[PDB]
TrEMBL record, chain B:
Species whose genome carries this gene: Porphyromonas gingivalis
Identification of the protein by name: DUF4295 domain-containing protein
Taxonomic superkingdom: Bacteria
Amino acid sequence: AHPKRRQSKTRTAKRRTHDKAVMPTLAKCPNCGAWHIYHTVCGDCGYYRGKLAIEKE
Amino acid sequence: GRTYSKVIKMVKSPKTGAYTFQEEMVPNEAVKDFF
Amino acid sequence: MIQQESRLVVADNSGAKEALCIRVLGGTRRRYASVGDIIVVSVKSVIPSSDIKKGAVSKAVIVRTKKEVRRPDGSYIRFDDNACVLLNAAGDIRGSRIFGPVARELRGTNMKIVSLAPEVL
Amino acid sequence: MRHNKKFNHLGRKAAHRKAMLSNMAASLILHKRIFTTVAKAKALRIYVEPLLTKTKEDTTHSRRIAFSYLQNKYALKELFGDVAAKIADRPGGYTRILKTGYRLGDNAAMCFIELVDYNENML
Amino acid sequence: MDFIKIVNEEFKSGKEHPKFNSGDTITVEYRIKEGNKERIQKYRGVVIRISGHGDKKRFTVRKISDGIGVERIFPIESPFIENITVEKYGKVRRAKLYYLRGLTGKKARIKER
Amino acid sequence: PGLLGKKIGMTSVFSAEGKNLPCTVIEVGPCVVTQVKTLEKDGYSALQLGFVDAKEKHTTKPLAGHFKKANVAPKRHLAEFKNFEGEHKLGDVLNVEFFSDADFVDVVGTSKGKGFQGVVKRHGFGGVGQATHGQHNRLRAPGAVGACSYPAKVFKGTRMAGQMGNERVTVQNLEVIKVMPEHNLLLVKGSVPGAKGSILLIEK
RNA sequence: CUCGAGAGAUUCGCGGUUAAGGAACUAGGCAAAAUGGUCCUGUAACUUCGGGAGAAAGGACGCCUGUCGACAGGCC
RNA sequence: GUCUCAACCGCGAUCUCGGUGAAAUUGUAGUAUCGGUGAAGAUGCCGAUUACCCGCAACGGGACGAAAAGACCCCGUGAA
RNA sequence: GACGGAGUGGUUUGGCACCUGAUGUCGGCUCGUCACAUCCUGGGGCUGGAGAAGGUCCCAAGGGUUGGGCUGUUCGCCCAUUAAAGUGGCACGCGAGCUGGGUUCAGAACGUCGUGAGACAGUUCGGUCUCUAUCUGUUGUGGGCGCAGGAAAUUUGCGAGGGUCUGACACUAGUACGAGAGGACCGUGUUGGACAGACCCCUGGUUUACCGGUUGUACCGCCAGGUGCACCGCCGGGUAUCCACGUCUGGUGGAUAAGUGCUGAAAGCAUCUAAGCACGAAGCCGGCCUCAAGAUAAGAUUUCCAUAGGGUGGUUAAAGACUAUGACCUUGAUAGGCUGCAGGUGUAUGAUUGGUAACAAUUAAGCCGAGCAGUACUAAUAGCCCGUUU
Ligand SMILES: C=C[C@]1(C)C[C@@H](OC(=O)CS[C@@H]2CC[C@@H](N)C[C@H]2O)[C@]2(C)[C@H](C)CC[C@]3(CCC(=O)[C@H]32)[C@@H](C)[C@@H]1O
Ligand SMILES: [K+]
Ligand SMILES: [K+]
Ligand SMILES: [K+]
Ligand SMILES: [Mg+2]
Ligand SMILES: [Mg+2]
Ligand SMILES: [Mg+2]
Ligand SMILES: [Mg+2]
Ligand SMILES: [Mg+2]
Ligand SMILES: [Mg+2]
Ligand SMILES: [Mg+2]
Ligand SMILES: [Mg+2]
Ligand SMILES: [Mg+2]
Ligand SMILES: [Mg+2]
Ligand SMILES: [Mg+2]
Ligand SMILES: [Mg+2]
Ligand SMILES: [Mg+2]
Ligand SMILES: [Mg+2]
Ligand SMILES: [Mg+2]
Ligand SMILES: [Mg+2]
Ligand SMILES: [Mg+2]
Ligand SMILES: [Mg+2]
Ligand SMILES: [Mg+2]
Ligand SMILES: [Mg+2]
Ligand SMILES: [Mg+2]
Ligand SMILES: [Mg+2]
Ligand SMILES: [Mg+2]
Ligand SMILES: [Mg+2]
Ligand SMILES: [Mg+2]
Ligand SMILES: [Mg+2]
Ligand SMILES: [Mg+2]
Ligand SMILES: [Mg+2]
Ligand SMILES: [Mg+2]
Ligand SMILES: [Mg+2]
Ligand SMILES: [Mg+2]
Ligand SMILES: [Mg+2]
Ligand code: NA
Ligand code: NA
Ligand SMILES: [Zn+2]
């Protein structure tokens, strides 16, 4: 129920070994040339898989 | 009754050399096969 | 599916009318008794002026159950109630008539029940 | 365990879940495309495609069966009017889901679902 | 291919019987054995349930004998069934008649069709 | 010795003696000998068999060179069996008639996966107390896990919650009901581990 | 009703159903189940003559037709 | 369904991800096991034994675990 | 087996007062683990052992070893069984696991003692059981690196764990033995109970997917037809999945213990032992099942590369907490849809015809289809990263 001792700096840092921000899965858009997430519609151009999907004004 | 019979023969043993004892219980009409 | 504290109808003319199972014979933790099984009962109620008395301890054999019984030919049988027949110390029955149907399982246990029952299954 | 239990409860009670699917379907028939989350849009697909299939048998019984789901007379008017004619030859697969990104407030996966016969750029 | 359907065909047992639904009154001619003597024992009652798939259905038939209710479950494809004859064509509003277990005479009667 | 099979499903059949028997349908399909293992090279004698036809798109180049050597069509599943009698060589074909002289068989499979399960379902624990009579929140609890200051520890092998199922299981002495060489079908009395479509080893 | 989204392990909170048995549970029938309305019958010991008493135990109950809330016939 | 003897179902909690973010406790710790030894019941001593480095879920045997300068008992030329 | 004597142990009652700014206490529940001084099952010696049934001692801890009535009870008595209903240790095992009936707070009462305040070798009714698990421990499941180049598979097993129970009948045989009552060893067989594992064809349960009846009320402008809410409103059914009450399967040579002997001296005889040798237990080791090369002693085999092979991603699953694992990713049936079918429910909307009406018969039943088969309509883009590929 209660910690018998405070953890040292080493023990705390060893546990935090597995605390990593997950990197996005990025791809370049063949139309725009911009980065977009793989398997999503490019927010800049609106295209997806070579076809127009969201005609943006 | 008359559903089995006892058969014994003695074979020399490589571990020692003297005769051991081999025993079973086979049906009455099977001892001629064993011996 | 009869166990300790179950109440059964008494299905012969032995005088008793309702019985309470005390024990299922034949095993340390044998839980249930089916048709053809032997149990030990206490007589809970009787007809006025009968031979056996209320509160007597007796052996009995089950002849009907509400839980369905399986047969090797793929058929099942169940009854509307659970019933038994009282037996004497020598293994025979203490009555003359059987009232109601009995199961075919007893053809392998007791021929006296089967011979003098109105119907089998 | 959930072996072979093929529908998403969507974190709602049964009466709530049925009401949301019916409100969402009306929105898709009236507006040819709507923006929602991915888990909600995949559950709508199993719900709205059989309803769009009922417009291939134009009768009083089909309209009333459809109305018992939507309970919205403007959606029924649109579903058995212009929507019925556009999908008269397509053998299923009337809708399409395309992923878009993530929401600011809870990082929910987003997408859009639409009727295929109303998107000209993708034909 | 389909292998359950091949096996069911190879191991087909029994004979054709006339069609009946729940709520019908039928007689079952069942073959029993007692001391190497084979005889047919009739069992007549109302069908209260049919369940299963295809040629493998099971039906439950209930009768009242000497004031005690009796229920029997029969496999339709069993080789022990000699004949099924339909006595009456009943009239019910549902598939399973479990409610007949709680009705006595003059209240368990079923209208004819 | 034995072959590889695929679980199809269960049904019930009537025998000639007039008994209702539950049977399991297994497709003990054609198995090719893909590698012969010998004493002088491998340390033991066994046969490696291949069961399910595989597309080239699903076969890696190391496995492609493995089947091409044996000169057989690539397979999806591979297993070893020992103690045959007949000295089959590379590329031979075996089928259901192998069991046409078999009275009983053993079936090895992988059981259905239950996931993480508590002590009540995994080990049949009785539970703590009744549902009433002062029960607070230990209805499906394990109870005590050990003694006091001596031991002063939990022993190895203590029964606890954890993953249940999805593991290799053997069922022995299954009675063979019929062999159907036409469809590569085998019929056995009883049940076998695993879901429909799972891969089984049948030992003669 | 000033946090949401997924997912649908164990376990807990609040709820639902359950074969056969029916208090064998437990310190203890704790908790739950069961009873439950209106009208018409019928109500024991005992009693301070007021009670006990809603004792206990039973029956009818929907819709339609007509007739003088009731009666009869019919329907599900 | 109190039990034999449990099984299944629904939501809330639970688990994973995004946002915000405490507390009790804390001499320092790279904190394994067994028997012995010992202020007389050992993670830390002796002799052996076992053990690649680092997490997550789940349960409570030990840390004479936490909390509160034992109310029992005795003592004070104490108190009410 | 008297009168007496020598030891062993530390589970009783004591003796001592050595540890303790708190080392939770009786009984029960749950979960066990160890011993053997063995209750049953296995193997023996002796008998005041004819047989049957016993008595006593020796070896043996593999497995097993019931449910109730009374009592807070432990313990006991009783009822009915069973092959048997073992004895103990583990803080009289186990309250950061449960309970709180008993003991031991504050209320009240009886007997009894005291002038009284009050008190008890007593009794009786009532009376809050706290904590979000850091270390270690234990059950599961991953990430990194290693394994003397990198990979895809198949494996040997150094070892570890699991499993280990048992009844009743038939024949031999109403025989051996025994005036008689009674009544065998050895050996074949046939059927049970308990426990465990897997599974869902059967029986039975669930089945807030689904279908139907019905009450009250409000909406879709009205009627008709539907829907919301009332515990899933209530009631009757119910597929797949998950299950037990169901079904199937399982408990399979060597060296020994207590003992029995052969040959045989020391010690002319005797002697199972001193040299040798043949036996001999549910026990030991193998045999059965599962894990298992971080077995740093890191093993073996087949093949590929030096585009081999992967990761991230997507459609998903009988796989799953997250992971991991399986299938598929367009020269594709992975999922949904569509088209059919097994199946559930039980005869829809409307329209005729009957009836005065409530209602009913015809006509396709209608709805659903978590399962199955077919079919690219929808979604699965080889983009990016390590070392030609979905
Ligand atoms: C309060 C101490 C307790 C909780 C219990 C204690 O019980 C007693 O004190 C019985 S007297 C009782 C006390 C309460 C009074 N209001 C009335 C009076 O009747 C007990 C059983 C021992 C006898 C002493 C040691 C112990 C630790 C180990 C243990 O088993 C404990 C102490 C250290 C423990 O913390
Ligand atoms: K220890
Ligand atoms: K079902
Ligand atoms: K498809
Ligand atoms: Mg972390
Ligand atoms: Mg699973
Ligand atoms: Mg329980
Ligand atoms: Mg409580
Ligand atoms: Mg609770
Ligand atoms: Mg019940
Ligand atoms: Mg019932
Ligand atoms: Mg009791
Ligand atoms: Mg009790
Ligand atoms: Mg109450
Ligand atoms: Mg929830
Ligand atoms: Mg968070
Ligand atoms: Mg010590
Ligand atoms: Mg130590
Ligand atoms: Mg403390
Ligand atoms: Mg102090
Ligand atoms: Mg001691
Ligand atoms: Mg302290
Ligand atoms: Mg001994
Ligand atoms: Mg204790
Ligand atoms: Mg406590
Ligand atoms: Mg404790
Ligand atoms: Mg007082
Ligand atoms: Mg009170
Ligand atoms: Mg508590
Ligand atoms: Mg099924
Ligand atoms: Mg069923
Ligand atoms: Mg409203
Ligand atoms: Mg509701
Ligand atoms: Mg309201
Ligand atoms: Mg001599
Ligand atoms: Mg592609
Ligand atoms: Na006085
Ligand atoms: Na389907
Ligand atoms: Zn772009």
